[PDB]
Design a binder for these strands. Structure first.
Ligand SMILES: [Mg+2]
Ligand SMILES: [Zn+2]
Ligand SMILES: [Zn+2]
Lengths: 64, 137, 103, 201, 91, 214, 102
RNA sequence: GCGCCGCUAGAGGUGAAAUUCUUGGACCGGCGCAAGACGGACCAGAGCGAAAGCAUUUGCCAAGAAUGUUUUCAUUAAUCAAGAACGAAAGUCGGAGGUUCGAAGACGAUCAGAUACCGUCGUAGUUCCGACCAUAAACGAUGCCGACUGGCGAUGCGGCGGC
RNA sequence: UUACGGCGGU
């Protein structure tokens, strides 16, 4: 039910997406091990390397 | 403590989890080692009320969590996989809920044994429901 | 229904050209009771007490009974005549090996 | 007056020294001077009669008993048969499939001759003239020249009368109509030319 | 010589009964009057008695066959299936 | 309101003594309610399980079926029912520009256990081979397929069920037609694809009690 | 004009090849005209690999493959963009596009 | 499709839905059974055939190409009015069968209207046996027979020779 | 998902 709200650090930004250039993909690292890393999407200006907060942990990235 | 088999502190008892990930829906039915006795059949179309989203990866994600929460609470603690597509006459690749009901079946504290795709394949048997010119869309 | 019948009805139309033979019931009944018969061939059509008393005399004369897989009208064409025939007896094979075969 | 032929079979009486003759519905394919075997441990060939509980699922059956020992009631007309499925060896009941396509669960010890009734294909030929229908029913009954009730008089039928030959009243009637009023389509579930197959169980 | 061109056996029915009913009859009518080859003596002497009854001139054997023809194709399929069910499962 | 899983008890499933791991797993069944007795609800259950959790170091692409024929209290004793390969193995070996030869035969053992054997073989590309199609000719296929079924008729007809089922944990039938066919056309992926059970000999009780003995 | 030298179809000494059916529209095509594509896709969806090997009963388990052979009509092959439009002299090669797996 | 179980409340269908099937328990999972279709992947710019066309094993046949030939006959030949044989699919007549698919038709959607596309259902028909009908973008849109005129990489079948 | 027309001569 309650997932731990996991703060996360981004490596390399994978370019814009979202059909209007509004969303970007970050492939966060999970702030416990940089070995464990998933691909995600965020909105707004990103600034490569910084830290962002995940209210939900793992569902899906931009992928058909 | 009335429910549960007799295991040790380290070992686990096996059940199979039939994934039927078609389009329009997804099934994350778990049952015993022979398949005859149903443990829990919950569906991605029983926890969304939209009817678009029955084949969604997200409805399959929480159907996999709900079937794990029933299975683990009953004493049966490790799963084999028998993923299906629609199969037979129809398509033979599984739908969007296939992977997400598999990963979230494991992220919610559950082991995984042998997996297999067990979809129905004909031997060049039967006609398809499209017409000769197919469906035109 | 593909390969093997012209073991026994290609040899039968070769004895018919080369060797000696008798057709009909009461001629192979004479040849069986005076030693001259070698291999009697019964059709799959003959009445079942006729099939018995030829299987019984051939035990008495120590000769062989081959059960042909066909009609009595089919055994007649396999002989090479315009008849029907249940029972034949070859009394000399010409140069083939019907007796030297399985029965 | 029957469309099927018969077969008279002489058995050997087990208790008296006597040969006694039965009359069977002729299963199709049988010939005279054929041995016919009848029992529980009889072997499943054409014309042999043996209980429906021992024979396998999907064998074709004619002249079968609807209650045990009733000496043959069902599936007896010329060319007709019944199929067995679904043995239940506990509470011994087997279901068969009647010539009308309607299935019926019957007792397991019901007895039945294996095969189809001879004389089949009979209704494929046209009667083709009024004279050969006359000889058909002279063997059967006094039933053949059927006068339409529209053609007769108001004493004689509910439909007759009028200056035009018309029925007037609706020709579908209820089932609890009395005698002398049940004429026409008696308790008809539907009318008109049929579509589908029958779609009502 | 050449006595007809279409009707054949149903030239006895004259102008009567309809063309398509006379055409429907002449398959049935050539078939119930035909001699068939006997499967027991090989002689083509299977004449039809009453409906469903078939009989040999020589060897005097009576066969219970079809109505307008010696074998019904429904009854040959069953005899195929009965001997198949008798060699399958061995009861 | 009622929970039907509180009325169910756990039995454990045992494989015969022909295998290393004797314990398959645990099934469940409801208890006795009058005519619903708790033994015929789990006689005749199929347990589609692989070799690598039934041997120790054997392959994983092969699986056994194992019907249940008897219940011994808390135990649930089994007997062999059939085998096949997995899907992913059986369609990783069907590739283009090679011949797939396949045979099948109905052979019964001397114990009365009529089987249907399914075997496959695929032609093999040679090491110096430059051309693309490693096809067989048709009369080569017919005599290979004759050679396949003649050998597995030997390996099953002669002796009982135990030595038969023991032959195809290493699959020495597929290795025996491997050697006996490579003077006709060489083959490389030669398995017994499937074994199907057609008959059972009335289930003498002591025969199953032999299989769970030593 | 005759557009292509074959007529879209790889039949030369035949009069009739088998009709098969397209996958995403169920339209009936000849077997030789049909645009085949044989997908050897891993069943695990590679982002979800370290979530099943850390929740398996082994440390080294080879993952099964999903072997789905698609085949398309040319109508749905151009719409789903598995064949691209080509120029009138760069049509004339039968080599498939290169791999580009990494 | 039907039996015997298991546990559950939805299943199905779609761009979204609905008509529809479902606590007289659908769908799903297990084990069986029956019926009728159809022979996947192997399957190819491969083979055979006069063309239409032809694909699961094994079985009685009858044919045929090519190659091999220091066999035989010795112009027996090519094309061919008239005349015939074969001929996809749909269609017609009769008897079997009837699983799926499905013209006609009914219904739900979609639209301004929908007699269309799309969805649920379904008749004739698709399957077999017998008789017909003789047409197709029956196409390599290219008659058949004969010789001659570049190269190259192969492939299918015979034959010959080589590490 | 829906997207139907555009008077004649120049
Ligand atoms: Mg009248
Ligand atoms: Zn006779
Ligand atoms: Zn398509």
């Amino acid at each position: 039910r309650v997932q731990p709200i996991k703060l996360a650090r981004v490596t390399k930004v994978l370019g814009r997406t979202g059909s209007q250039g509004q969303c970007t993909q970050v492939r966060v690292e999970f702030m416990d091990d940089t070995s464990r890393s998933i691909i995600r999407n965020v909105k707004g200006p990103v600034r490569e390397g910084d830290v962002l907060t995940l209210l939900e942990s793992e569902r899906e990235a931009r992928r058909l | 403590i009335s429910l549960g088999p007799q295991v040790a502190e380290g070992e686990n008892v096996f059940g199979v989890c039939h994934i039927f990930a078609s389009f329009n829906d997804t099934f994350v039915h778990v049952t015993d080692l022979s398949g005859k006795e149903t443990i829990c059949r919950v569906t991605g179309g029983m926890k969304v009320k939209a009817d678009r989203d029955e084949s969604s990866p997200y409805a399959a994600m929480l159907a996999a969590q709900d079937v794990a929460q029933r299975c683990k609470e009953l004493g049966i603690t490790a799963l084999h996989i028998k993923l299906r597509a629609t199969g037979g006459n129809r398509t033979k690749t599984p739908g969007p809920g296939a992977q997400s009901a598999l990963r979230a079946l494991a992220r919610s504290g559950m082991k995984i044994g042998r997996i297999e795709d067990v979809t129905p394949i004909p031997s060049d048997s039967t006609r398809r429901k499209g017409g000769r010119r197919g469906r035109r869309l | 229904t593909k390969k093997s019948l012209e073991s026994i009805n290609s040899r039968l139309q070769l004895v018919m050209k080369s060797g000696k033979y008798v057709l009909g019931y009461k001629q192979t009944l004479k040849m069986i009771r005076q030693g001259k018969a070698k291999l009697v061939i019964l059709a799959n059509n003959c009445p079942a007490l006729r099939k018995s008393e030829i299987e019984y005399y051939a035990m008495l004369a120590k000769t062989g009974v081959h059960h042909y897989s066909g009609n009595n009208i089919e055994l007649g064409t396999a002989c090479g005549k315009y008849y029907r025939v249940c029972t034949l007896a070859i009394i000399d094979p010409g140069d083939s090996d019907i007796i030297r075969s399985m029965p | 007056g029957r469309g099927a032929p018969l077969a008279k079979v002489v058995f050997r009486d087990p208790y008296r020294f006597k040969k006694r003759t039965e009359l069977f519905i002729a299963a199709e394919g049988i010939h005279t001077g054929q041995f016919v075997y009848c029992g529980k441990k009889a072997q499943l060939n054409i014309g042999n009669v043996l209980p429906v509980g021992t024979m396998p699922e999907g064998t074709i059956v004619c002249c079968l008993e609807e209650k045990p020992g009733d000496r043959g009631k069902l599936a007896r007309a010329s060319g007709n048969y019944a199929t067995v499925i679904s043995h239940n060896p506990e509470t011994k009941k087997t279901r068969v499939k009647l010539p009308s396509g309607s299935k019926k669960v019957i007792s397991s010890a019901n007895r039945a001759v294996v095969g189809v009734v001879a004389g089949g294909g009979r209704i494929d030929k046209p009667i083709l003239k009024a004279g050969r229908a006359y000889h058909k029913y002279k063997a059967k009954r006094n039933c053949w020249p059927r006068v339409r009730g529209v053609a007769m008089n108001p004493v004689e039928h509910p439909f007759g009368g009028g200056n035009h030959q018309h029925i007037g009243k609706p020709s579908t009637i209820r089932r609890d109509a009395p005698a002398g009023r049940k004429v026409g389509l008696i308790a008809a579930r539907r009318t008109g030319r049929l579509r589908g197959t029958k779609t009502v169980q | 010589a050449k006595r007809t061109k279409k009707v054949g056996i149903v030239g006895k029915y004259g102008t009567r009964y309809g063309a398509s009913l006379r055409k429907m009859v002449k398959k049935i009518e050539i078939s119930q009057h035909a001699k068939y080859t006997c499967s027991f003596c090989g002689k083509t002497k299977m004449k039809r008695r009453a409906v469903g009854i078939w009989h040999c001139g020589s060897c005097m054997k009576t066969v219970a066959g079809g109505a307008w023809t010696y074998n019904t194709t429904s009854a040959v399929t069953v005899k195929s299936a009965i001997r198949r069910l008798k060699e399958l499962k061995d009861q | 309101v009622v929970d039907p899983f509180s009325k169910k008890d756990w039995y454990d499933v045992k494989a015969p003594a022909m295998f290393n791991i004797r314990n398959i797993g645990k099934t469940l069944v409801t208890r006795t309610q009058g005519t619903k007795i708790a033994s015929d609800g789990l006689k005749g259950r199929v347990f589609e399980v692989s070799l690598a959790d039934l041997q120790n170091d054997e392959v994983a692409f092969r699986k056994f079926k194992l019907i249940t024929e008897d219940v011994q209290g808390k135990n649930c004793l089994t007997n062999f029912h059939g085998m096949d390969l997995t899907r992913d193995k059986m369609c990783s070996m069907v590739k283009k520009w090679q011949t797939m030869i396949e045979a099948h035969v109905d052979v019964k053992t001397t114990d009365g256990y009529l089987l249907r054997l399914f075997c496959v073989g695929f032609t093999k590309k040679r090491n110096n081979q430059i051309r693309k199609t490693s096809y067989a000719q048709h009369q080569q296929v017919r005599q290979i397929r004759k050679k396949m079924m003649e050998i597995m008729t030997r390996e099953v007809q002669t002796n009982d069920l135990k030595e038969v089922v023991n032959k195809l944990i290493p699959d020495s039938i597929g290795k025996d037609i491997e050697k006996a066919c490579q003077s006709i056309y060489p083959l490389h992926d030669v398995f017994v694809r499937k074994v199907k059970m057609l008959k059972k000999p009335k289930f003498e009780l002591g025969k199953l009690m032999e299989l769970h003995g030593e | 004009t005759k557009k292509r030298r074959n007529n879209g179809r790889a039949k030369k000494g035949r009069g009739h090849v088998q009709p098969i059916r397209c996958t995403n529209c169920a339209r009936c095509v000849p077997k030789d005209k049909a645009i085949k594509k044989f997908v050897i896709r891993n069943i695990v969806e590679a982002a979800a690999v370290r979530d099943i090997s850390e929740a398996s009963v082994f440390d080294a388990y080879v993952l099964p493959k999903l072997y789905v052979k698609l085949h398309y009509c040319v109508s749905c092959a151009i719409h789903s963009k598995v064949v691209r439009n080509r120029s009138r002299e760069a049509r004339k090669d039968r080599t498939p596009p290169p791999r580009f797996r990494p």
